[PDB]
């Protein structure tokens, strides 16, 4: 299997600097140029910069939003992609994607990374409140039962949310966050029979990256 | 300086229904030595990484399914889908090759489907955050269409605005509808004041608004 995963990502001050790297397996990495790729939250694809393969130097070229401020290099002997970036600022905040790029023969992008979020901003880490939702002496009996997490005021994003470690996945609802003073909030739902909660358990999983968060908040009933 | 544009920014489809959208690039993207048109598309699901669709401006990617044709040349392209599905919901991007990378801007394909009625819960806030100060009121409106509703809050029967936010998901890969969650939040010392506490949903699949509510006395 082709595998591509960034790392790196995370809370920067404007004027800093930030490295991101790229593991690969899967393919010759020698015989690949290799780009990366940034989106904005909600905006486009901006392709930034590739270097290009062993036959041809291993040269670099860059876009004009980016050139002379953002440098790319490769590890061959561990097939490892990096980006360098510099003097930092709040239009750098994005999703950042390494992509396989050009093999000499080949016009594509073959296969893309599953991104590390960059979030350029001088607010302070804070972790998330994480708050069982469950039902109050509701109707509760409709065949069904729709319980939540709510993880609230934390930066930056992002946080993960799975529930039952991943067991329940139909039936599931994460909404996107929202920023308010400085923090976000998001929540998550979960929809299952009511004959199996509470009579088995259901519990949220949830991560945030920038604070090192791991809550596994169990969804109790009354 | 190849400037790439897409068209639409975006529209809705239903599914069995066929697809078409357009890629523009500033000049002509066929390569003289290849003859081929260095253009290729990509899909990008919600939440998900891109994904290459077509490369060539023609040529399909293995795994890719047939009802997916790119189509043009030079400095017009073009890609279809014919028998849309639910799982088509995505946003699709063009990129030029010829001399070092660019994209186009995107199109947004969103899938249009019968109008559904939102399933409403309603929830108090947790004893461990009211321990800490605070009170979050959270109502979930889930597994309607089309995407436009509204919520209000009552408290003691009274609307109220202010502390209010709302989040709608993207559209459903599977059954094309969106869910939103809206949460209020008070301070304890405001939440202890009152006792009943209500979301009300209207929606256009009925005049009637989808009201869930709670009372603190019977927590
Ligand atoms: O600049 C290049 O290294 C490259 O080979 C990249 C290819 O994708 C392609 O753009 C090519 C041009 O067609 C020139 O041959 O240049
Ligand atoms: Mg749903
Ligand atoms: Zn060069």
């Known amino acids: 299997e082709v595998k591509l995963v960034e790392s790196g990502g995370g809370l920067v001050q404007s004027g800093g600097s930030l490295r991101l790297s790229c593991a690969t397996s899967?393919?010759?990495?020698?015989?690949?140029?290799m780009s990366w790729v940034r989106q904005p939250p909600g905006k486009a694809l901006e392709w930034l910069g590739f270097?290009?393969?062993?036959?041809?130097?291993?040269?670099?070229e860059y876009s004009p939003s980016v050139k002379g401020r953002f440098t790319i290099s490769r590890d061959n002997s561990q097939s490892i992609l990096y980006l360098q970036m510099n003097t930092l600022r709040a239009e750098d905040s994005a999703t950042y994607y390494c992509?396989?790029?050009?093999?000499?023969?080949?016009?594509?992008?073959?296969?893309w990374g599953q991104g590390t979020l960059v979030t350029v901003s001088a607010a302070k880490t804070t972790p998330p409140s994480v708050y069982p939702l469950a039902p109050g002496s509701a109707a509760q009996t409709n065949s069904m039962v729709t319980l939540g997490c709510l993880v609230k005021g934390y930066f930056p994003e992002p946080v993960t949310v799975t529930w039952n470690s991943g067991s329940l996945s139909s039936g599931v609802h994460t909404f996107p966050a929202v920023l308010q003073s400085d923090l976000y909030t998001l929540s998550s739902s979960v929809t299952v029979p009511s004959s199996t909660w509470p009579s088995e358990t259901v519990t949220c999983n949830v991560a945030h990256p920038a604070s090192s968060t791991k809550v596994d908040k169990k969804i109790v009933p009354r | 300086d190849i400037v790439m544009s897409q068209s639409p920014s975006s529209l809705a489809v239903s599914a069995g229904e066929k697809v078409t959208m357009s890629c523009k690039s500033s000049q002509s993207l066929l390569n003289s030595r290849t003859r081929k048109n260095y253009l290729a598309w990509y899909q990008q699901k919600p939440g998900q990484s891109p994904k290459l669709l077509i490369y060539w401006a023609s040529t399909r990617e293995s795994g890719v399914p047939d009802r997916f044709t790119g189509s043009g040349s030079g400095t017009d392209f073009t890609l279809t889908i014919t028998s849309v599905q639910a799982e088509d919901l995505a946003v699709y991007y063009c990129?030029?090759?010829?001399?070092?990378?660019?994209f186009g801007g995107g199109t947004k394909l969103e899938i249009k489907r019968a109008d559904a009625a939102p399933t409403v819960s309603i929830f108090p806030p947790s004893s461990e955050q009211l321990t800490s100060g605070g009170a979050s009121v959270v109502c979930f409106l889930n597994n309607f269409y089309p995407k436009d509703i509204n919520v209000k809050w009552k408290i003691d029967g009274s609307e109220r605005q202010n502390g209010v936010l709302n989040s709608w998901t993207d559209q459903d890969s599977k059954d094309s509808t969106y869910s939103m969650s809206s949460t209020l939040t008070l301070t304890k010392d405001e939440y202890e004041r009152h006792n009943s506490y209500t979301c009300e949903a209207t929606h256009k699949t009925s005049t009637s608004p989808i009201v869930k509510s709670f009372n603190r006395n019977e927590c």
């Open positions: 899967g393919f010759t990495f020698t015989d690949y140029y």
């Open positions: 270097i290009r393969n062993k036959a041809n130097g291993y040269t670099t």
């Open positions: 992509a396989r790029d050009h093999d000499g023969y080949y016009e594509r992008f073959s296969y």
């Open positions: 990129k030029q090759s010829y001399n070092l990378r660019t």
